[PDB]
Write an enzyme that holds these catalytic residues in place. Structure first.
Site, short mmCIF file in Angstrom:
data_model
loop_
_atom_site.label_atom_id
_atom_site.label_comp_id
_atom_site.label_asym_id
_atom_site.label_seq_id
_atom_site.Cartn_x
_atom_site.Cartn_y
_atom_site.Cartn_z
N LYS E 157 0.87 -1.23 0.00
CA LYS E 157 0.00 0.00 0.00
C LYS E 157 0.85 1.21 0.00
N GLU E 183 0.24 3.83 11.15
CA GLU E 183 1.11 3.26 10.23
C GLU E 183 2.36 2.70 10.89
N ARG E 184 2.78 1.55 10.28
CA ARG E 184 3.88 0.69 10.75
C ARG E 184 5.21 1.54 10.86
#
Lengths: 204, 53, 101, 470, 469
Positions: E157, E183-184
Site C-alpha cells: 500500500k 502506520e507501521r
C-alpha cells in the site's frame, strides 16, 4: 417562491450565502400523505431524454420510479439528465409541462454539490432549481430531516398547480442516519441493525 | 479419415472439458463454504445487539 | 460457440443493432420529437441492413438530415403527439432515403 | 364499565405507554382513546407491564401526542360497525369513511378479534370454482371453498389478476366479497376504486357485491397490521349471521407479516430467523384458520403475496406456502415475455387437482400437457451447447406442440387497457379440456404459435388461423 | 479552567474520572493524568453525570491507581502549527518523535476544527498528471478531485504512495503534507531517510515537505486522532498561508478500525458486523475538512485496507461517497505478474464521463474498458474449452484484450529495485498516443512478451528486438 435559486440546509435557511427567503407561508416536516380521495390517476408524461429510459420504463407525474444500481456509477448523472431535459418545455407558455426541481443530497461532500450547481447554472437551469442539502459532517438528525423538509417544499408547488420533481439521493444513507440515533437512544433493531420502523419513515 | 480425427478430437476436447469443469466445481464449493460462514456470523450479531439493549 | 442456423441468426443480428441503438453517452439528452424517428428505424428493421459499427454514425447523420429537410414533419409529431398514416409514410420515406447511410 | 383514566408516560414511537389507575384494571386487547386534534387516537393494549401500566401499539399516527394527557378506556375491543351498509364504501382501520359518503352506520357492531372455529364446525370443499382463465383452469384448477394463494415477484400482474376476478366472479356469484387492502399504495387504492365503479361491481345508488377497507402504508407499523383483521370481520358477519358463501379477497398479505415484524422488535422481543419476528408462525396460523370453510358459510379466499427478491425459500412466504391449497407461481420472466398470466404451471401445486376432484379426464389432459412442457424445459440444456440443428426429429415435433401450448397460456384481460389492448374472454372448464386435447392429438401442429396469441376457446383459435392467412 | 479530579476507574482503555468540585468541562476538552511515567492525555467523550465523565485514552492505561489525580487543560488537545512544522515529525500529543525538541510555533490549535462551510468552494477540477500510465488513462487526477484506492496490500500500500510522491511531488513543487494514521514504524524511518537523500527535506536546509506519523503499537484512541493532528496542519496551510498543497493518507482503514474498538467500551451499541454507529458523521468531518476553499486547493490520495477484498463491507462503502475518482488496486492482478495491480474495471474519475479529458482521450479509454469487459465475459468459455472452439472474430478480440491487460504494467521508479525492472516514466500526453496505436493492430502482431513489463510505445518495439535474438 423565494426558494428558487437557493441552496438551503435542512432547516430551510441559506448556506451558500445568498439573500434571505422571500416566503409566502410556513409548513411542517411531517404532514400526512394525500389519501385515495384527493388522488386522480396518472395522465401526464415525464421525459428523460435518454431513449431506453422513456421507451422501456416511461415516467409520469405522481409516479415514483426507483433508480437502483451500485454506488457511484454516475447515479447522480442519470438523475441530472432528466433535470436538464425538462428545460425545453419549462421555458415557454405551457403550464402542464413545467419543472421546479428539488434536488436532495444527503451524505455528500460539499465539493460534489459545488460541481453540480455550476453545471446547472451553465446549462441555464439554476433559475428554478432548489438544493436541499445535509452534508455528512453535519449530524445524523439533520441528515434525516433533509428528505422530509424537501417533500413539504414540494407539497406547496404541487398544491398550487405547479409541477416539480424531487430526487431523493440517497435514501440508503437516510436509513443509516436513522440507525446512528436509534442505537444510541437504545431502541431494538429491525433487520441488519436498521430500526424496525424505518419502513414507516420511507412510506409516509 | 477426416471424420475420424474429428469425432476423435471431439472426444478428447470433451474429456478435457470435464477436468476443467471439475476445478470450477471445487472452487464454487469453497465459495459456498465462505458464504455460509458469513451468513451464520452476521445473523448472530443482530440477535445479540437486540438482547444487549 | 454453438453452431447457429439462419432462423436463430435473424434474431441475433436484429438484436445487436437494437442494443447499439439503445446506446448513449453521458450528458446528451434529446426531445421526444426526435426519439420517435430513431425507434422506428430500429423496430421496423432499417438497421438490419446497416452495419453494426456504423449504427452510431447513422443515428447522428440521420438527425442532421431531418433538421434541414423534414423539420416540418418533426414539428407535427411534437404538436400532435401521434403519427398519422401520412406521418408514418413520410417517416418511412425518410428512413429509406438515408438507409445506405 | 365506568371510564378508566390513565395518563401518558413515554411516547417512544408507535409504542406509547399509558398509566391507568389501580382498583380498576384494563385487559389485553381493549381500545384506549386519546383526545387529539386529529380525531381520537385508538390504542390496542398489547401488554401489561405490571402496576397497571400498558404498552400499546397505535392504530393511528403517534405525532403531536401530549405528555401526561388523559386516556379513556372503552372497556372492550376495537369494535367496527358491520352491516350490508358496508357495501360500496371504503372504510379504514377504525371504522371511518375515506371516500366521504358519511359514517358507515348499521344496527350491529362486532369486535376484530375472534378465536378460530373448533374441529367440529369444519366443512370440506366439494364444489367447483370457474376461473375463466385457461392456464389456471386446466393446469392448476381453483375450487370453491379454496384457500387459493397468488405468490409472485414485485408487481408481476398480482393486482391485474385480482381486478379481473372481482369484475367477473363477484358479480356473477350471489354472495358477498370483501376486498381488503392492507397497507397498499395511494395510487393503487384509487385505481382499484375507479375500476370497480366502471365495471359495475360498485353502484353507489344501490347495493354492492364488494366492500372495501383500504388501509394506508403511512400509518404506524401497529396500525398496518390490523387493517387485515378489520376487513375479515365484515366477511365473518356475512359468513356467519347472514349465511352467505363469501368470495374473499385480500392484498397483499406479505404486508401483514412485515407490519407485525416492525413492532415485534420494539415490544422487547429479540429477532429470529431472517430478521423476521419469532411470532411468525402463531400470527399466521390464527389468520389462516379463521379463513377456513365451515358449515355456516364457505369462504374462498384469494390472497396476494409478495415474494421478496424472487426468493420463496424465505421463511415468511414458506410458512404461508403450506396453508395455501392452490399455490401460484407467477414468474417475472414470463410477464415480460408477453404472456399474461405469467403462471408457471410446473410449480403451481393444487390440492384440488386430482383424478376425482376434477375427475380422471381432466386430470389426464392436464398431466399430458405438463410432461410435454417438461420436455421442452429439460431439452434446453441440450439445445444450449450441442445446438438445435443436431436435435432429433421426434423431439422437435414434441417441442413444437409445447411451444404452441406455451403461447396458448396467454389470454387477454378486460381490466388491462393499458397493459393489454384486447378485451377479456372467459373460458369454461369443459372448453379448456377439449381445446388442449386437440393440440396433443395434432390437430394443432401445423398452425402457428402466434395463432394462439390472445384467443379464448377453440373457435377463436380456428378463426385466428384465417386472420394470419390473409 | 483548572479542574481537579481523581481516577475513579479504568475500564478497558476508556478511563472514567470523578471530579472533586462542582466545575465541569465541556465535551472534547482534554485532561492529563500525572504519573512519574510521563503523562497520559485523555479526551472527554461522555458525561455520565454525578460528576463522573468517561474519557477516550490516547495512552495505554498500565499502572493506574484508583484515587489518583487528573487535571483539566480546559480545551481539546493542542498541536503546534506554523511554517516551522516542516522537516518535523509530529505524533498526536503535538510532541516530536524524531527528537528535534520543542516544535516552534506562533499558534497552537485544537485538533478538532469545525468544517469549512459551503460558501468556501473552488470549482477547480483541472488536470494534474500522475506520470503512471494506467492512472492517466482510466482515472486522471484533478485539482479538486479525491482519489481512493481500496483492497489489501498487493504491491504494498505504502510503496504505491511512494511512487506518487516521487513523480507528482517534484513537479507540483511547494508544500505537501503526509499524515499516516497508525502506520507501521519501520516504514516511516525508511521514507525520512529517502527524503533527505533525495534532498527534499533537509534539517540543515529547507523542508518543503512536512510530516505526521503515528505508530501501530499505540492505543486505539491515539491512532484515531493521528488523522485529525495532520488535518489541523493541512488547513493552516490551505487557508492562512493560502498555498496549494497535496495530501497523502495511508492507512485510513486504521482510523475507522480504531473508532470501532473504542465504540463498544464507551457504552454504545454498535452496528452490524461490528462497526461503529457514528461512522457517517465522523467520516463526514474528515472529508469536509479537506474540502477546497477559495484560498488554496488541494488534492488527496487515500488508501483503504479491506480484510476480505469486499468493498460492500460498511467501512469501504462510506468512503465512496467522499470520492469522485478511484484507482482500485487488486490483489489478483499483482499475483498474476502485472505491476501496478490496478483493476481496470473498477476505475472511475469524474472527468472520464464526457470530453473533460478531451474527446480523443475519452475514445481510447472507452474502447479499452469495452475490450477488457468482453475478456472477463469470455473467461468461463476460455477455461471450459478455449478460443478456437469460439468464432473467429471473438478469437481476435480475446487475443487483443490479452495484449491490453499486459500492456498496463508500468515499472515503478522509486521501487525499480523491488520490481526488478528499471522504471519508466510515461507521460499523460504519451499514454494517449501509445494506447491509440495499440488499439488499431500496430503492435498486436508481435509477442505477449513484448507487452510484459513495458512503458510507452517505444519499449514494445525494443522488447521485440530482444525476443528475436
Amino acid at each position: 417562491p423565494g426558494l428558487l435559486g437557493r441552496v438551503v440546509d435542512a432547516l430551510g435557511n441559506p448556506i451558500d450565502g445568498k439573500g434571505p427567503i422571500d416566503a409566502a407561508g410556513r409548513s411542517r416536516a411531517q404532514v400526512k400523505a394525500p389519501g385515495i380521495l384527493p388522488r386522480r390517476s396518472v395522465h401526464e408524461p415525464v421525459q428523460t431524454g435518454l431513449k431506453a429510459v422513456d421507451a422501456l420504463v416511461p415516467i409520469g407525474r405522481g409516479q415514483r420510479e426507483l433508480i437502483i444500481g451500485d454506488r457511484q456509477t454516475g447515479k447522480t448523472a442519470v438523475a441530472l439528465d432528466t433535470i436538464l431535459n425538462q428545460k425545453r418545455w419549462n421555458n415557454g407558455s405551457d403550464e402542464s409541462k413545467k419543472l421546479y426541481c428539488v434536488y436532495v443530497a444527503v451524505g455528500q461532500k460539499r465539493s460534489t454539490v459545488a460541481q453540480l450547481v455550476q453545471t446547472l447554472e451553465q446549462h441555464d437551469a439554476m433559475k428554478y432549481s432548489i438544493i436541499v442539502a445535509a452534508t455528512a459532517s453535519e449530524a445524523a438528525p439533520l441528515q434525516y430531516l433533509a428528505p422530509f423538509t424537501a417533500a413539504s417544499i414540494g407539497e406547496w408547488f404541487r398544491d398550487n398547480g405547479k409541477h416539480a420533481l424531487i430526487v431523493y439521493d440517497d435514501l440508503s444513507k437516510q436509513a443509516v442516519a436513522y440507525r446512528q440515533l436509534s442505537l444510541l437512544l437504545r431502541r431494538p433493531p429491525g433487520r441488519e441493525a436498521y430500526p424496525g420502523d424505518v419502513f414507516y419513515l420511507h412510506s409516509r | 479419415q477426416g471424420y475420424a480425427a474429428e469425432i476423435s478430437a471431439r472426444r478428447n476436447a470433451m474429456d478435457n472439458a470435464s477436468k476443467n469443469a471439475g476445478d470450477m466445481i471445487n472452487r464454487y464449493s469453497i465459495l459456498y463454504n465462505r458464504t455460509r460462514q458469513a451468513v451464520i456470523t452476521n445473523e448472530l450479531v443482530d440477535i445479540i445487539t437486540g438482547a444487549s439493549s | 460457440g454453438s453452431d447457429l442456423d439462419a432462423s436463430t441468426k435473424q434474431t441475433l443480428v436484429r438484436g445487436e443493432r437494437l442494443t447499439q441503438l439503445l446506446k448513449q453517452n453521458q450528458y446528451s439528452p434529446l426531445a421526444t420529437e426526435e426519439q420517435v424517428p430513431l425507434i422506428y428505424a430500429g423496430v421496423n428493421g432499417h438497421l438490419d441492413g446497416i452495419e453494426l459499427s456504423r449504427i452510431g454514425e447513422f443515428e447522428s447523420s440521420f438527425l442532421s438530415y431531418l433538421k434541414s429537410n423534414h423539420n416540418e414533419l418533426l414539428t407535427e409529431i411534437r404538436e400532435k403527439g401521434e403519427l398519422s398514416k401520412e406521418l408514418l409514410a413520410s417517416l418511412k420515406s425518410a428512413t429509406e432515403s438515408f438507409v445506405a447511410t | 364499565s365506568t371510564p378508566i383514566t390513565g395518563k401518558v408516560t413515554a411516547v417512544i414511537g408507535a409504542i406509547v405507554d399509558v398509566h391507568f389507575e389501580q382498583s380498576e384494571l384494563p385487559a389485553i386487547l381493549n381500545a384506549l382513546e386519546i383526545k387529539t386534534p386529529q380525531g381520537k387516537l385508538v390504542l390496542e393494549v398489547a401488554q401489561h407491564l405490571g402496576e397497571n401500566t400498558v404498552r400499546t401499539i397505535a392504530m393511528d399516527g403517534t405525532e403531536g401526542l401530549v405528555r401526561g394527557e388523559k386516556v379513556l378506556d372503552t372497556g372492550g375491543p376495537i369494535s367496527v360497525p358491520v352491516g350490508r351498509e358496508t357495501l360500496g364504501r371504503i372504510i379504514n382501520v377504525i371504522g371511518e369513511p375515506i371516500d366521504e359518503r358519511g359514517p358507515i352506520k348499521s344496527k350491529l357492531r362486532k369486535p376484530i378479534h375472534a378465536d378460530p372455529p373448533s374441529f367440529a364446525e369444519q366443512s370440506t370443499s366439494a364444489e367447483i370454482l370457474e376461473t375463466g382463465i385457461k392456464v389456471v383452469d386446466l393446469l392448476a384448477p381453483y375450487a370453491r371453498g379454496g384457500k387459493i394463494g397468488l405468490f409472485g415477484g414485485a408487481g408481476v400482474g398480482k393486482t391485474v389478476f385480482i381486478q379481473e376476478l372481482i369484475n367477473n366472479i363477484a358479480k356473477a356469484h350471489g354472495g358477498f366479497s370483501v376486498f381488503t387492502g392492507v397497507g397498499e399504495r395511494t395510487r393503487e387504492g384509487n385505481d382499484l376504486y375507479r375500476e370497480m365503479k366502471e365495471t359495475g361491481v360498485i353502484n353507489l345508488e344501490g347495493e354492492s357485491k364488494v366492500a372495501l377497507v383500504f388501509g394506508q402504508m403511512n400509518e404506524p407499523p401497529g396500525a398496518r397490521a390490523r387493517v387485515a383483521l378489520t376487513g375479515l370481520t365484515i366477511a365473518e358477519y356475512f359468513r356467519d349471521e347472514e349465511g352467505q358463501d363469501v368470495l374473499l379477497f385480500i392484498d397483499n398479505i406479505f404486508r401483514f407479516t412485515q407490519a407485525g415484524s416492525e413492532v415485534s422488535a420494539l415490544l422487547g422481543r429479540i429477532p429470529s430467523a431472517v430478521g423476521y419476528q419469532p411470532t411468525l408462525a402463531t400470527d399466521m396460523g390464527l389468520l389462516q384458520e379463521r379463513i377456513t370453510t365451515t358449515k355456516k358459510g364457505s369462504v374462498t379466499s384469494v390472497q396476494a403475496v409478495y415474494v421478496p427478491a424472487d426468493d420463496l425459500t424465505d421463511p415468511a412466504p414458506a410458512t404461508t406456502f403450506a396453508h395455501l391449497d392452490a399455490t401460484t407461481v407467477l414468474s417475472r420472466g414470463i410477464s415480460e415475455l408477453g404472456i399474461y398470466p405469467a403462471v408457471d404451471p410446473l410449480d403451481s401445486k393444487s390440492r384440488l387437482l386430482d383424478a376425482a376432484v376434477v375427475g380422471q379426464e381432466h386430470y389426464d389432459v392436464a398431466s399430458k400437457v405438463q410432461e410435454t412442457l417438461q420436455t421442452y424445459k429439460s431439452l434446453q440444456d441440450i439445445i444450449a451447447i450441442l445446438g438445435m440443428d443436431e436435435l432429433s426429429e421426434q423431439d422437435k415435433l414434441t417441442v413444437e406442440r409445447a411451444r404452441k401450448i406455451q403461447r396458448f397460456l396467454s389470454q387477454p384481460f378486460a381490466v388491462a387497457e393499458v397493459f393489454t389492448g384486447i378485451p377479456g374472454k372467459l373460458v369454461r372448464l369443459k372448453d379448456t379440456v377439449a381445446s388442449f386435447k386437440a393440440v396433443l392429438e395434432g390437430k394443432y401442429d401445423n398452425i402457428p404459435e402466434h395463432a394462439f396469441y390472445m384467443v379464448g376457446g377453440i373457435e377463436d383459435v380456428v378463426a385466428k388461423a384465417e386472420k394470419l392467412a390473409a
